[PDB]
Amino acid sequence: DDFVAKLQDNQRFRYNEVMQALNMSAALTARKTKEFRSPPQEQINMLLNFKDDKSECPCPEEIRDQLLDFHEDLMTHCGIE
């Protein structure tokens, strides 16, 4: 509930600055807006790929840290350590 709320807020932010910055460089906007162009399932998948150190995800570090902490608390609760 709160993780997705923060994710939606940060994706609101990023898109707002991309839209206010599209004028200064129109060419980059075509590649930059594929995230918002993608279907919502693909958007979630690509925005949730920050696992490991590949880090291609356009996700803020705090939002990454929240999920990286919940995912280790869950493993401790599931006895996977």
Binding site: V4, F36, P40, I44
Partner: peptide, 19 residues
């Protein structure tokens, strides 16, 4: 082009759908 860019907004998606 704004409409085609804005199709499928995961921030305009309702909370439960996003969850």
């Amino acid at each position: 082009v704004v409409a085609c860019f804005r199709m499928a907004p995961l921030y305009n998606l309702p909370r439960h759908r996003a969850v």
